[PDB]
Design an enzyme around this catalytic site. Sequence first.
Site, short mmCIF file in Angstrom:
data_model
loop_
_atom_site.label_atom_id
_atom_site.label_comp_id
_atom_site.label_asym_id
_atom_site.label_seq_id
_atom_site.Cartn_x
_atom_site.Cartn_y
_atom_site.Cartn_z
N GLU A 108 0.88 -1.20 0.00
CA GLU A 108 0.16 0.12 0.06
C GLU A 108 1.02 1.14 0.07
O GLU A 108 0.52 2.35 -0.70
CB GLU A 108 -0.84 -0.04 1.33
CG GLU A 108 -2.03 -1.22 1.35
CD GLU A 108 -3.14 -0.87 0.08
OE1 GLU A 108 -3.11 0.27 -0.57
OE2 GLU A 108 -4.09 -1.79 -0.07
N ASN A 160 -9.16 5.40 2.66
CA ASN A 160 -9.87 5.78 1.69
C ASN A 160 -10.83 7.06 2.57
O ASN A 160 -11.38 6.51 3.44
CB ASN A 160 -10.65 5.09 0.78
CG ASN A 160 -11.22 5.49 -0.38
OD1 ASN A 160 -11.29 6.64 -0.59
ND2 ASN A 160 -11.28 4.81 -1.39
N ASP A 169 -6.48 8.03 -0.79
CA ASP A 169 -5.98 7.18 0.05
C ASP A 169 -4.79 7.83 0.89
O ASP A 169 -4.04 8.34 0.28
CB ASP A 169 -5.52 5.96 -0.32
CG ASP A 169 -6.63 5.03 -1.07
OD1 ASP A 169 -7.78 5.26 -0.85
OD2 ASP A 169 -6.15 4.12 -2.07
N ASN A 205 -7.79 8.72 -5.89
CA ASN A 205 -8.47 7.53 -6.72
C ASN A 205 -9.27 7.99 -7.56
O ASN A 205 -9.28 9.37 -7.80
CB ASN A 205 -9.46 6.54 -5.66
CG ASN A 205 -8.69 6.06 -4.40
OD1 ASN A 205 -9.11 6.36 -3.17
ND2 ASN A 205 -7.44 5.53 -4.76
N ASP A 246 -15.48 -4.51 9.12
CA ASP A 246 -16.55 -4.34 8.16
C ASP A 246 -17.35 -5.60 7.41
O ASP A 246 -18.54 -5.09 7.01
CB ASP A 246 -16.08 -3.31 7.19
CG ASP A 246 -17.21 -2.61 6.35
OD1 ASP A 246 -18.27 -1.79 7.09
OD2 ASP A 246 -17.04 -2.67 5.31
#
EC number: 3.2.1.17
Length: 129
Positions: free
Chosen positions: A35, A59, A52, A46, A101
């Site tokens: 990353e 994000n 990000d 993005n 999540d």
Amino acid sequence: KVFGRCELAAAMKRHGLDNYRGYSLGNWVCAAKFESNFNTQATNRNTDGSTDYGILQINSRWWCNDGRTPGSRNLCNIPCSALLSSDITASVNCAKKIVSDGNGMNAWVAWRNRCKGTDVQAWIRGCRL
Ligand code: NA
């Protein structure tokens, strides 16, 4: 801050990421490598206009407020700039919510594409943890 591999592994472990939601420390170090190359100041725009931020490229579309992502949320309740600190506490706290999540570490497309299924233990090999 650009972390060393065993330095980041140590900081992630101390902040309780090691086996968090069943993901071994090597998975988190692998995710951070691809990353951000372990750079806490990394930012990437993005296509959708979101950005990000930080070691784990969190994000602005869902997780942090940068003031320029229309129709976005701030589910970690933080300015995105907090995700660029040399102190990884905010990135780690926010990553814990993301990985909880429902899709686990698949939320990090670079983890899915480059870490998932691989010998991730290599990322913490020889580290004093
Ligand atoms: Na946002």
